[PDB]
């Protein structure tokens, strides 16, 4: 559950920012699904 | 942000039961008219009612002297458009976001210098006593409680209310969607523009009969009637004397008992 | 001035009122705010503008001159006397 919760909860934060070109896979690797524009790659730069 | 002990509400919103339970939620809603977060109050006005809650914040109630839920005027129980008409209060209140946010800030500063018991100046200090009478003689006197009943059950409109007699919502005819009373907006009802129920009031108030002097400018005579029969029920000539010399110099008074 | 030229006197008033919040010690703004009212024959507005100006900056002669002169040109000479009397109450130059 804590993994389902945490996974869902990070996905919501991605979607809350409309970063729908990022994908959080189930082992929590954060993959860009497409080559990123300067706008997209700036906008999607999550922090620590 | 703004906070208070108790909501600005009219008695028909509170119900006839003088014992109430109410919930306070600080900053629990944004004000429908200005998006500012405000302390929200929620209550059920007697059994069979729905849970009502405050819709306006107190500054927006004070800046129109309106009930925070039903947004009728707190003095006469009339919509704003009716009251702003009779008092000649123009649509002065700003409506654009940054402009009216600035305005409301100054209202709150100004009222904060007062005693807290008054609306804004325009309506706190209006004195047209004839206009006050026109409003008094059209405001509803009894509290209308039917405006706190539950919403109509959409599943009953769909013909499929799967809760049956356990459904709290109303199982009855909607208002016909061609009637303009079905199509109301909180902003229209607050600022007092294009309000359907206001126009239905103003028209029927204007259609009421009235005195008007004749074209005979030489006539200065008034008939007076309903004086009752002769005897102890009849008004004396002194009675008319005392009531009517208030207004002007009677040349003659003729009594016909 | 531009709002006056478009006839938007009520807008023009608020703009001068907002100017005075920025610099209430600017004699130019009070005079230009006054002159535009009396250009528009808004004599009771203009009187209120001058009473504020002379109330706030009693040492600025330009308000007392322009105000008492306006009240004289408009032939309210006992009004003009009381302006000069109120001026002399400040023991002016």
């Amino acid at each position: 559950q804590v993994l389902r919760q945490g996974y869902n909860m990070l996905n919501l934060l991605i979607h809350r920012k409309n970063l729908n070109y990022l994908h959080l896979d189930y082992n929590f690797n954060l993959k860009p699904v497409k080559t990123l524009t300067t706008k997209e790659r700036k906008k999607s730069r999550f922090g620590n | 942000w703004e906070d208070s002990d108790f909501p600005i509400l009219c008695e028909t919103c509170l119900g006839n039961n003088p014992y109430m339970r109410m919930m306070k939620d600080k900053y629990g809603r944004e004000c429908k008219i200005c998006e500012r977060p405000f302390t929200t109050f929620r209550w059920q006005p007697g059994k069979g009612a729905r849970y009502k809650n405050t819709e306006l914040c107190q500054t927006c109630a004070k800046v129109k002297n309106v009930c925070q839920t039903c947004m009728f005027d707190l003095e006469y129980g009339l919509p704003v458009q009716v009251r702003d008409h009779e008092l000649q209060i123009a649509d002065n209140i700003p409506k654009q976001g940054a402009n009216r946010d600035f305005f409301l800030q100054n209202v709150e500063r100004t009222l904060g210098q007062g005693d807290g018991t008054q609306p804004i100046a325009q309506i706190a200090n209006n004195m047209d006593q004839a206009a006050h009478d026109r409003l008094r003689r059209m405001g509803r006197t009894q509290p209308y409680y039917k405006r706190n009943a539950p919403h109509i059950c959409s599943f009953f409109v769909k013909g499929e209310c799967k809760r049956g007699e356990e459904c709290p919502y109303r199982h009855e005819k909607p208002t016909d969607p061609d009637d303009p009373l079905s199509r109301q907006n909180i902003r229209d009802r607050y600022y007092g523009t294009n309000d359907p129920v206001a126009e239905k009031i103003l028209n029927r108030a204007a259609a009421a009969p009235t005195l008007s002097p004749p074209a005979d400018t030489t006539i200065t005579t008034l008939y007076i009637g309903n004086l009752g029969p002769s005897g102890a029920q009849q008004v004396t000539e002194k009675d008319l004397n005392d009531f009517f010399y208030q207004y002007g110099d009677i040349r003659c008074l003729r009594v016909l008992t | 001035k531009w709002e006056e030229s478009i006839g938007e006197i009520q807008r023009a008033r608020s703009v001068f009122e907002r100017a005075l919040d920025v610099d209430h010690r600017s004699i130019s703004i009070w005079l230009q705010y006054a002159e535009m009212e009396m250009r528009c024959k808004q004599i009771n507005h203009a009187r209120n503008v001058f009473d504020r100006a002379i109330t706030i900056m009693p040492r600025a002669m330009q308000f007392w001159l322009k105000y008492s002169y306006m009240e004289e040109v408009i032939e309210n000479i006992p009004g003009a006397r009381q302006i000069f009397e109120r001026w002399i109450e400040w023991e002016p130059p």
Partner: protein
């Protein structure tokens, strides 16, 4: 003549984030009305000054 009402406080959910945006910015309230300037009379400048 009077109502009497029990005011309970609605329970806040601790797991609920801040509800409303407050990045709004609006002009300052206008200053309190002008204090009269209260100067000593002007001292005349000569053109030499």
């Amino acid at each position: 003549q009077q109502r009497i009402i029990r005011m309970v406080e609605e329970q806040k959910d601790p797991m609920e984030p801040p509800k409303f945006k407050i990045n709004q910015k609006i002009p300052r309230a206008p200053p309190s009305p002008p204090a009269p300037v209260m100067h000593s009379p002007p001292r005349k400048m000569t053109a030499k000054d």
